């Protein structure tokens, strides 16, 4: 079926990648992070797409509204996929080792009075298990709603979605910041950067715009529809992919020029990442391939709105987040030897299939385009 | 004979009415109204898009080359300086000039085109002193024809006779 | 619907004409008195300055800057509001900005004027600033492009220009309208000859399509510049080695400060441009309602950064950056930061109560107070970590002189002086697109 | 209004172009305000010595 | 500064330097650079030289 | 500060307060992001009659106590003006060589001051943030560590 092929091939591949958790152990936990958080950024990005669609309300991109909402209930499934981190969590973050604060080791890493309150691995349990009570609660309060305004239309149809956006809104941006400050800030904790809570955010809402976009571009050609969602719908998605590629590269470069300048001890993210060990290769071929080829190819409005291109971009626009995030997650291990392993990729094509398994099975579970909705024909007859 | 006028108070006619005449008859080089009658160039205005993005081509390149030449000529080769060990016009501190200074010299060319499409500075406008075009913004949403090869003859006045016009000046 | 007015396409022209028809206002004659008096106080102390020397401002050497550059970030951060509701609101195409837009790049461009004077004048050697420009000068010398103080120059010398040229182009249909009126009904027959800024306007098909894509262009081409102008003016801080600056979140932050500052002044102008000389039918109160969201967005995005600052002091800070923010709360400027953050956080989180508080008189008493924290935001962030930075030897309070304050005041003076000046000449409202967007301009009738 | 402002882009363009021509073919910045034959107290006359 | 970037167009062999009626020889330049290779003059390009 | 007892134990204690990193180089001569395009590896900083002799200026702080003549010869050799009470009150002084003193007690045990004096001229850096930042190129790492 349409729902089980990304799932059976991806979970067929994920169950194969059990070999990673068994063999070449410490490799697979962190190929799992670069994959796991990608699925989370996919959840994180396309959810914020729904939010901003409601705050400054936009009845022009609403045919591309129901489908992000499907993407969100991933994140509850992303809970039970937190497990492989936890067995390797004592092996990853380097503050879980607890032979370093003031035990008999030669190291008294200045973490005792500074960080140990914020980080203590039973606290890390709640610092994320708390987020499951929010980012899922948005699902059970939004996805339960927006799927339900179709069959059981309300007197107050959107303004309940606004209520999520009235108090469930800011907590999101907070928990994204502290999440990034808890997951990906901490691999090389000899580093202090305030922006990086947004590089994870923007680098998510960067991507998931593409996945939502390419899905229709796939589901327009030999899909269940072919002409309902008109071209100038995607014309806005381009205007978003530029307006958020800016909000990425502004951030990925403000992380760079600021730290390229000062040369501080916090720089040691990049004395090990950028220059050395086959990764100046990465950053160059990244940025040429991550900002300028999109910002150049999509630019002119004579093929910017065409479906199959922006669909072709969602591949080059989201497959690349592997290359964006493999510049953050894994290199603290292969700092010695830039030899990216087969296990680095099985979880990329795995979770990017497994998330999409659930994503179609829910679109198999119920409708695709909302059978009734405010301003639908206003966006369809456009 | 420089052209016609059509007092159309309808905001909507200019889509459907004027689309008749670009097909049936002549080209209608010039339609007149303040605001964008929406969905015009869908069929009416004869355009895939603006053309002068291809003329915005030379705006970005020269400015980009300007800054990038303002530093390969400046930071290393002619009067360099060991300011803070900065490696001689390494990209990043050049980005907010190789980006931003491009915007100025590339925008102004983006508007030099705008001031060049049929050469907007032509205050000489032998129709504009028409004694009733002077309520352009409010009265109606007008039409016009230069003396094209299908020359403005009584048939055109007869054509727009049934395209409901408050009046028909003939400059 | 997003404007409440019993209007047609014509009803605006008679009204905005009456706002530019005849020259006999009285409140003008008071504003041009007190404001120009403010400008007089400005130059009365600004050439008193340069003939004498910088130190009449209250600047010690550790805090070399004080209130002038603080006001530069203010009087440019205040201005991004105007250009971005011209650009952003077309990018998202909310079809909503039209009631206020043309009055906003004014509120930007004059801010940029009273801004740019500071980089020309908080220096001690003003006359030798053309060296900063990349002219091939009388020797083989050229500026240093690793310096954000230079990026500021090109940025503002481009941002004064792009925002102008995007405003001047924005107001072509006005000059068309006024050039059209000057003949048949208006000031004089010789206002038409003054309105050659119409530039042979006729509202034609051939170039109106181009006007749209250009307005699209500058929207998608001034926003990438706006996000670089104020970011440059933040890069100058955060590029440094200071702990209270080197924190990398600042360029998005100060930008949000520019939002949370600029709209915090536009509302001050719209309230007073709504009571006596107001447009009830075009400046709908529902507009200010949906206006304060994008303020209240940055009413919390500004707040999240304070948490990060206040957090990273506890997470992995240098033992100085640990102290750098304890200074901000606990120390000399406890009067500032406790109240400032609380001012910039209470009032926005006290703002959304009665459906965003549509009530007009609360807007003035709040929009001020929202902004006063901004002048503190840049007097705090800049200076509170510029003393008490990496030595006790460089510990010194900042005593601002009585000339620091008359320059601040004078910045309000020249702002109002020149904002009012062209505003009475140009039309306030973006009357071209107002009657073109929400009313029956749609061909579906 | 006026019929022959087709000539007006010329003086706008050309006089602006001449703005550049008059700028750079006029500079002589450290060649005009340098050279001079000052009157000494006595004339040494390096010629003769 | 044109000399401190392009010196060998100007410098004299030091034999009777104060000679106003001095036409230099042919093959002047290559006869000079052999001195900068040997004498090792290395003119200044910096701010430290004269401005302090 | 440090004792002869402690000094006898760890001669590498001037670094121990902020030592080098996990496995990375000693602190001076520590590479930046850039090492291949670093100006010391480019000619235009390296090509003069100066690079022969890099200049530096240590301070045997063990014999430095507030004689305060370290200043005054700077004031006369490399000229300055003075400053008035009415002016220095706002905190400006045109003495280049601060001779700042400091107190260190045992966490305020018996209020034993146990002062320290240490001069602090402009340690004319290599990485030198100040050099980078003058837009009007009034600073440069002149040859020989001089940052003039
Ligand atoms: C040739 C045409 C020259 C002109 C004109 C100027 N200078 Fe020169 N200078 C020249 C040479 C060949 C050398 C190098 C000699 C060596 O063996 O090193 C120099 C060197 C200097 C220095 C050296 C540094 C020092 O000893 O303090 C200085 C300060 C200097 N030159 C200054 C200087 C000034 C101020 C000039 C014009 C105003 C100038 N030079 C012109 C050759 C030539
Ligand atoms: C001689 C060895 C010099 C070197 C090397 C540099 N400068 Fe120069 N500069 C020099 C002179 C003799 C003059 C006077 C020219 C005049 O106008 O009469 C100058 C001029 C300047 C100026 C302008 C000062 C003015 O009054 O207009 C500046 C700002 C300047 N020089 C800066 C400068 C810098 C930054 C240099 C390297 C870092 C530099 N100069 C080299 C002599 C010499
Ligand atoms: S204070 Fe200066 S001059 Fe006095 S003893 Fe110390 S080093 Fe010498
Ligand atoms: S920045 Fe300049 S003055 Fe300051 S310590 Fe470094 S070299 Fe010395």
């Amino acid at each position: 079926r349409i729902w089980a092929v990304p799932l059976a091939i991806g979970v067929g591949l994920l169950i194969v990648s059990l070999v990673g958790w068994a063999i070449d152990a410490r490799q697979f936990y962190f190929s799992y992070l670069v994959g796991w958080t990608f699925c989370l950024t996919l959840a994180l990005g396309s959810l914020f797409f729904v939010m901003i669609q409601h705050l400054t309300r936009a009845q022009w991109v609403v045919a591309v509204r129901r489908l992000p909402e499907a993407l969100v209930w991933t994140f509850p499934v992303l809970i039970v996929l937190f497990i492989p981190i936890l067995f390797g969590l004592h092996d990853l973050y380097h503050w879980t080792h607890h032979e370093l604060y003031d035990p008999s080791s030669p190291e008294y890493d200045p973490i005792l009075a500074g960080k140990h309150a914020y980080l203590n691995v039973p606290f890390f349990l709640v610092r994320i298990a708390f987020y499951f009570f929010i980012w899922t609660l948005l699902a059970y309060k939004l996805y339960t709603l927006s799927v339900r305004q179709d069959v059981d239309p309300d007197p107050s149809i959107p303004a309940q979605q606004r209520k999520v956006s009235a108090w469930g809104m800011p907590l999101y941006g907070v928990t994204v910041a502290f999440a990034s400050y808890d997951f990906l800030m901490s691999l090389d904790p000899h580093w202090y950067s305030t922006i990086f809570g947004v590089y994870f955010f923007a680098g998510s809402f960067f991507v998931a715009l593409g996945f939502i976009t390419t899905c229709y571009a796939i589901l327009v050609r030999r899909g269940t529809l072919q002409g309902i969602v008109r071209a100038p719908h995607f014309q806005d998605l381009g205007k978003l992919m530029f307006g958020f590629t800016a909000f990425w590269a502004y951030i990925a470069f403000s992380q760079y020029m600021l730290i390229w300048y000062g040369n501080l001890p916090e720089e040691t993210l990049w004395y090990r990442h950028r220059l050395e060990h086959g990764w100046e290769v990465l950053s160059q071929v990244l940025i040429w391939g991550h900002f300028v080829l999109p910002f150049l190819i999509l630019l002119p409005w004579a093929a910017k709105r065409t479906p199959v291109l922006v669909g072709t971009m969602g591949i080059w626009f989201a497959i690349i987040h592997w290359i964006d995030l493999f510049w953050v997650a894994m290199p603290v291990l292969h700092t010695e030897h830039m030899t990216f392993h087969w296990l680095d990729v099985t979880c990329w094509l795995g979770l990017f299939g497994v998330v999409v398994g659930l994503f179609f099975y829910r679109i198999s579970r119920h409708s695709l385009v909302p059978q009734n909705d405010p301003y639908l024909a206003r966006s369809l007859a456009l | 004979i420089y052209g016609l006028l059509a007092e159309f108070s309808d905001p909507a006619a200019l889509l459907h009415a004027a689309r008749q005449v670009r097909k049936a008859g002549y080209r209608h080089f010039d339609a007149h109204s303040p605001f964008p009658i929406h969905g015009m160039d869908e069929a009416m205005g004869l355009g895939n898009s603006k053309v002068a993005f291809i003329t915005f081509f030379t705006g970005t390149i020269a400015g980009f080359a300007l800054a990038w030449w303002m530093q390969w000529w400046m930071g290393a080769v002619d009067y360099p300086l060991n300011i803070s060990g900065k490696p001689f016009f390494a990209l990043p501190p050049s980005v907010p000039i190789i980006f931003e200074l491009t915007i100025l010299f590339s925008a102004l060319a983006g508007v030099a085109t705008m001031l060049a499409l049929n050469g907007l500075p032509r205050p000489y406008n032998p129709l504009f002193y028409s004694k009733n075009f002077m309520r352009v913004t409010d009265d109606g949403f007008f039409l016009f024809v230069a003396a094209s090869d299908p020359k403005f003859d009584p048939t055109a006045t007869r054509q727009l006779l049934e395209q409901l016009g408050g009046y028909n000046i003939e400059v | 619907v997003l404007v409440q007015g019993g209007l047609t396409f014509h009803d605006i022209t008679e009204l905005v004409a009456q706002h530019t028809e005849k020259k006999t206002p009285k409140a003008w004659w008071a504003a041009f008195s007190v404001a120009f008096l403010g400008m007089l106080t400005l130059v009365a102390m600004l050439a008193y300055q340069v003939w004498n020397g910088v130190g009449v401002w209250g600047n010690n050497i550790p805090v070399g800057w004080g209130w002038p550059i603080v006001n530069f970030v203010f009087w440019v951060g205040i201005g991004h509001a105007g250009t971005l509701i011209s650009a952003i609101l077309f990018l998202f195409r909310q079809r909503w900005r039209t009631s206020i837009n043309r009055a906003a790049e004014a509120m930007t461009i004059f801010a940029v004027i009273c801004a740019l004077i500071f980089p020309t004048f908080h220096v001690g050697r003003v006359w030798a600033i053309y060296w900063t420009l990349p002219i091939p000068n009388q020797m083989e010398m050229w500026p240093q492009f690793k310096s954000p103080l230079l990026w500021d120059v090109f940025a503002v010398s481009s941002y004064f220009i792009v925002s102008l040229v995007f405003w001047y182009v924005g107001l072509i249909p006005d000059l068309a309208t006024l050039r059209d009126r000057a003949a048949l009904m208006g000031r004089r027959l010789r206002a038409k000859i003054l309105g050659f800024f119409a530039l042979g306007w006729c509202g034609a098909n051939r170039h109106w399509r181009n006007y749209e894509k250009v307005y699209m262009l500058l929207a998608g081409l001034a926003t990438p510049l706006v996000l670089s102008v104020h970011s440059v003016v933040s890069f100058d801080f955060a590029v440094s080695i200071i702990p209270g600056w080197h924190t990398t979140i600042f360029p998005p932050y100060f930008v949000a400060g520019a939002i949370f500052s600029g709209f915090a002044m536009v509302v001050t102008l719209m309230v007073i441009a709504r009571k006596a000389y107001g447009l009830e039918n075009v400046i709908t109160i529902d507009h200010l309602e949906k206006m304060n969201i994008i303020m209240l967005v940055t009413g919390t995005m500004v707040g999240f950064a304070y948490i990060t600052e206040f957090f990273i002091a506890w997470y992995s800070g240098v033992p100085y950056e640990q102290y750098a923010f304890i200074n901000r709360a606990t120390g000399p400027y406890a009067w500032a930061y406790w109240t400032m953050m609380s001012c910039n956080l209470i009032f926005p989180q006290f703002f959304w109560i009665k459906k965003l508080r549509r009530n007009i008189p609360f807007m003035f008493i709040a929009s001020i107070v929202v902004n006063i924290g901004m002048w503190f935001e840049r007097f705090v962030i800049t200076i509170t970590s510029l003393h008490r930075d990496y030595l006790p030897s460089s510990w010194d309070y900042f005593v601002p002189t009585w000339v620091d304050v008359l320059t601040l005041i004078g910045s309000f003076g020249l702002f109002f002086t020149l904002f009012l000046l062209f505003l009475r000449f140009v039309p306030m409202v973006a009357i071209a697109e107002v009657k073109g967007v929400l009313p029956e301009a749609d061909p579906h009738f | 209004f006026s019929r022959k402002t087709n000539r007006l882009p010329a003086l706008s363009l050309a006089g602006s172009v001449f703005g550049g021509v008059l700028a750079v073919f006029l500079v002589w910045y450290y060649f005009s305000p340098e050279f001079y034959e000052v009157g000494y107290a006595p004339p040494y006359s390096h010629r003769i010595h | 500064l044109e000399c401190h970037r392009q010196p060998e167009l100007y410098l004299r062999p030091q034999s009777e330097i104060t000679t106003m009626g001095y036409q230099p020889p042919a093959d002047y330049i290559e006869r000079n650079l052999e001195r900068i290779r040997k004498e090792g003059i290395r003119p200044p390009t910096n701010c430290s030289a004269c401005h302090y | 500060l440090a004792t002869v007892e402690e000094f006898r134990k760890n001669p590498d204690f001037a670094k121990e307060a902020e030592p080098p990193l996990e496995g990375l180089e000693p602190w001076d001569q520590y590479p930046t992001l850039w090492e291949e395009n670093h100006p010391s590896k480019q000619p235009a900083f390296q090509d003069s009659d100066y690079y022969r002799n890099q200049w530096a200026m240590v301070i045997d702080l063990n014999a430095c106590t507030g004689c305060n003549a370290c200043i005054v010869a700077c004031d006369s050799e490399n000229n300055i003006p003075m400053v008035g009470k009415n002016e220095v009150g706002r905190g400006r002084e045109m003495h280049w060589l601060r001779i700042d003193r400091y107190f260190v007690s045992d966490e305020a045990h018996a209020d034993d001051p146990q002062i320290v004096v240490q001069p602090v001229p402009c340690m004319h850096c290599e990485n030198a943030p100040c050099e980078s930042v003058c837009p009007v190129a009034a600073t440069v790492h002149s040859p020989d560590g001089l940052n003039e």
Side-chain angles (χ1 to χ4, degrees), chain E residues 1 4 6 14 23 30-31 35 37 39 41-42 47 51:
Chain E
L1 189 144
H4 293 178
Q6 185 181 0
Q14 187 61 255
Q23 64 184 358
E30 293 182 354
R31 185 174 177 86
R35 188 172 67 183
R37 183 176 64 79
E39 188 68 25
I41 57 177
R42 297 187 294 276
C47 297
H51 286 285

Side-chain angles (χ1 to χ4, degrees), chain C residues 90-412:
Chain C
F90 185 78
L91 294 171
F92 296 166
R93 62 180 184 179
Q94 189 170 0
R95 302 291 77 198
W96 174 72
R97 58 92 177 168
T98 189
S99 64
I100 193 167
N101 190 5
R102 197 159 285 151
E105 303 89 357
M107 182 267 181
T108 299
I109 194 75
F110 299 107
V112 170
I113 291 166
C114 71
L116 181 60
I117 56 172
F118 286 102
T120 61
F121 291 149
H122 72 84
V123 302
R125 293 180 64 183
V126 177
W127 60 90
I129 193 166
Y130 64 96
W131 297 345
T132 308
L133 279 295
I135 62 173
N137 60 5
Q138 293 76 240
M139 60 290 200
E140 293 186 356
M141 286 297 302
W142 290 273
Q144 186 63 255
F145 300 100
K146 281 73 173 174
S147 296
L149 275 297
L150 179 63
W151 299 346
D152 188 4
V153 175
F154 293 169
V156 174
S157 182
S158 177
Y159 179 72
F160 180 79
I161 301 301
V162 172
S163 180
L164 180 66
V165 172
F166 177 58
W167 178 60
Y168 181 77
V169 171
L171 58 90
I172 297 296
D174 290 342
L175 276 293
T177 302
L178 276 297
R179 185 271 305 280
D180 193 359
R181 289 177 70 87
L184 280 295
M185 72 299 287
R187 294 180 293 170
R188 283 94 171 90
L189 183 63
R190 298 281 77 80
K192 185 179 181 179
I193 195 166
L194 189 149
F196 65 90
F197 296 165
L199 294 172
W201 189 261
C202 62
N205 186 4
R206 182 175 291 174
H207 61 82
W208 184 263
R209 185 182 63 245
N210 194 2
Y211 182 80
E212 187 68 20
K213 180 68 172 176
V214 168
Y215 185 82
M216 179 179 167
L217 184 63
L218 279 295
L221 185 62
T223 294
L225 186 142
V226 165
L227 274 291
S228 68
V229 170
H230 205 75
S231 181
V232 160
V233 177
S234 174
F235 283 156
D236 63 355
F237 300 164
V239 71
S240 180
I241 306 299
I242 301 302
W245 296 358
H246 186 71
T247 56
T248 310
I249 194 165
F250 283 9
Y253 173 76
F254 286 108
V255 167
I259 305 302
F260 189 67
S261 302
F263 296 163
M265 181 63 76
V266 173
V267 174
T268 60
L269 273 292
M270 292 301 100
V271 170
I272 191 165
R274 178 68 175 81
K275 181 67 180 294
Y277 292 99
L279 279 298
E280 177 172 2
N281 300 114
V282 178
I283 301 297
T284 188
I285 194 67
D286 296 331
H287 185 78
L288 295 176
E289 185 270 331
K290 182 62 71 177
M291 193 69 202
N292 306 118
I293 292 296
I294 189 70
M295 183 184 285
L296 181 58
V297 171
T298 61
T300 61
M301 187 66 206
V302 168
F304 294 168
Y306 287 105
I307 300 164
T308 59
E309 293 177 353
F310 185 75
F311 180 76
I312 297 301
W314 185 258
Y315 180 78
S316 300
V318 183
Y320 296 101
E321 191 272 332
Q322 286 177 354
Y323 184 83
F325 298 169
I326 299 298
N327 182 11
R328 290 183 182 181
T330 63
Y333 295 160
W335 62 271
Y337 184 77
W338 290 99
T339 61
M340 178 186 76
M341 185 180 173
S342 296
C343 175
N344 293 322
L345 274 296
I346 293 166
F347 286 95
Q349 77 91 30
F350 184 76
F351 183 76
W352 59 274
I353 296 168
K354 184 66 176 175
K355 185 62 69 68
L356 290 70
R357 294 290 298 276
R358 295 178 183 271
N359 286 321
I360 188 164
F362 181 81
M363 305 308 298
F364 182 72
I365 297 165
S367 183
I368 294 166
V369 174
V370 171
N371 198 5
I372 300 300
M374 305 292 96
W375 182 64
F376 292 167
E377 184 184 357
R378 282 70 174 273
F379 179 74
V380 161
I381 293 166
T382 56
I383 292 164
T384 308
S385 178
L386 184 60
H387 70 87
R388 294 177 182 274
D389 52 353
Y390 294 153
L391 293 176
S393 70
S394 299
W395 284 3
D396 280 325
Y397 181 80
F398 176 77
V399 61
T401 56
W402 60 271
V403 174
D404 302 323
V405 70
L406 299 174
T407 302
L408 178 67
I409 295 162
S411 66
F412 293 104

